Amino acid sequence: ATKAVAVLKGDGPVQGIINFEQKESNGPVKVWGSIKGLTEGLHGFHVHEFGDNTAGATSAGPHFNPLSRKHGGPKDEERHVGDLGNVTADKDGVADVSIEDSVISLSGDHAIIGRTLVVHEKADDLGKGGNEESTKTGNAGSRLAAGVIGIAQ
Amino acid sequence: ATKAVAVLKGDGPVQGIINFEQKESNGPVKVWGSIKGLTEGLHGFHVHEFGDNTAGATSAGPHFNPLSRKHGGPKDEERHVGDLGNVTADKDGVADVSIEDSVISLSGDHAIIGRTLVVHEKADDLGKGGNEESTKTGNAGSRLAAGVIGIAQ
Ligand SMILES: [Cu+]
Ligand SMILES: [Cu+]
Ligand SMILES: [Zn+2]
Ligand SMILES: [Zn+2]
C-alpha cells in the first residue's frame, strides 16, 4: 500500500493530522484523522494545487484541477480532483475525518503528493450556490489551516 | 521547468524558505533561498525520506536513500540521494543557500517532492568522519528545522 500525511496548521487554533492510505494505485484513497479548533458544523475540505506555504495557505493556489473542470462535490463527475467536499466538526470543535475518494490518488502524474490540504472557514456548497464562485470554490470562505501532503510510511 | 519549495520551521528560531527549480527532467536542480536563526558555521542539509511532519523533523525518517548507498557529500559518487551537504550561516546566523545538484530530481519515481528538507545543528562531515555514524548521518546532530517539499507555481 501507499500512504501520505498532512499536518494542518494556520494562524488561528485550527490544527490536525490527516492520513491518506491507498491500498492499490488504481484504488480509492482513504482519508482520516482529527482536526480540532473548528467551529461546529461543515467546513470545506480540498486539495489545492501548490505545496507552497510561503504566504501561508494563500500561496497554495486554487483547487487542484488537472482535468480543467468546474467545482463540484466529491460525488459529482463534474468536479475538481481536489474536491473532497466537507468535513464536520462536533460540538467540541473536533472533526473526526473519515472520507473515501476514488478520484484523488497518491501516485501518478495527477498525485496529490506535494500539494496542499486546506480546511476552510465555511461549508462547501458543492457547486449548488447559483453563482460563479460556487462553481470555482464552493463558497467555502477563508483558509483556516493547511498542510503540504507528504509521503508517509 | 518544474518548481518546488520548502518552508523550514521547527521548535526554535531556525526558519527559512528554500526553492527548487529543474529546467529539464534529466537536468540538474537549482536549490536556493535563505535560512535564519542558525549558529555561525556549517549545518548539515538533507532531504529525508518521509514528508511526515507529525513529530516535526523527527518523523521524516532517515536521509532519502532509494539506491541503498552510504552517506556522503553531494559531490561524492557514494551518497544518499538526499545528501545536499552543508549550508553556511554567517555571523548574523543567516545562511544564503545556492546549490546545484544533479542527483536529486523533482520528477520520476525517486522525486524528492513530498519528502522533507531538514537543516541540522552541526556540520555534516560528508561521510569522512571515520565512524559508523558518519556513513549514516554525517554526524550532523539534531534536526533544527524542516519542511515538506511541495510543488510550486
Ligand atoms: Cu480549499
Ligand atoms: Cu538530515
Ligand atoms: Zn473545487
Ligand atoms: Zn546521507
From Swiss-Prot, chains A, B:
Positions of modified residues (N6-acetyllysine): K122, K136
Entry EC no(s): 1.15.1.1
Cofactor field: Cu cation; Zn(2+)
Modified residues (Phosphoserine): S98, S102, S105, S107
Effect of H80S: Destabilization of dimer and loss of zinc binding
Enzymatic class: oxidoreductase
Alphabetized UniProt keyword annotations: Acetylation, Amyotrophic lateral sclerosis, Antioxidant, Copper, Cytoplasm, Disease variant, Disulfide bond, Lipoprotein, Metal-binding, Neurodegeneration, Nucleus, Oxidoreductase, Palmitate, Phosphoprotein, Ubl conjugation, Zinc
Modified residues (N6-succinyllysine): K3, K9, K91, K122, K136
Record-listed Zn(2+) binding positions: H63, H71, H80, D83
Lipidation (S-palmitoyl cysteine): A6
Gene3D superfamilies in UniProt: Superoxide dismutase, copper/zinc binding domain (2.60.40.200)
Main location as per UniProt: cytoplasm
Disease: Amyotrophic lateral sclerosis 1: A neurodegenerative disorder affecting upper motor neurons in the brain and lower motor neurons in the brain stem and spinal cord, resulting in fatal paralysis. Sensory abnormalities are absent. The pathologic hallmarks of the disease include pallor of the corticospinal tract due to loss of motor neurons, presence of ubiquitin-positive inclusions within surviving motor neurons, and deposition of pathologic aggregates. The etiology of amyotrophic lateral sclerosis is likely to be multifactorial, involving both genetic and environmental factors. Spastic tetraplegia and axial hypotonia, progressive: An autosomal recessive, neurologic disorder characterized by loss of motor abilities in the first year of life, after which severe, progressive spastic tetraparesis develops. Affected individuals have severe axial hypotonia, hyperekplexia, hypertonia, and myokymia, reflecting upper motor neuron involvement. Cognitive development may be affected.
Function in brief: Destroys radicals which are normally produced within the cells and which are toxic to biological systems.
Subunit annotation: Homodimer; non-disulfide-linked. Homodimerization may take place via the ditryptophan cross-link at Trp-32. Heterodimer with SOD1. The heterodimer CCS:SOD1 interacts with SLC31A1; this heterotrimer is Cu(1+)-mediated and its maintenance is regulated through SOD1 activation. Interacts with DAOA; the interaction is direct.
Name this protein carries in UniProt: Superoxide dismutase [Cu-Zn]
Source species of the chain: Homo sapiens (Human)
Gene expressing this chain: SOD1
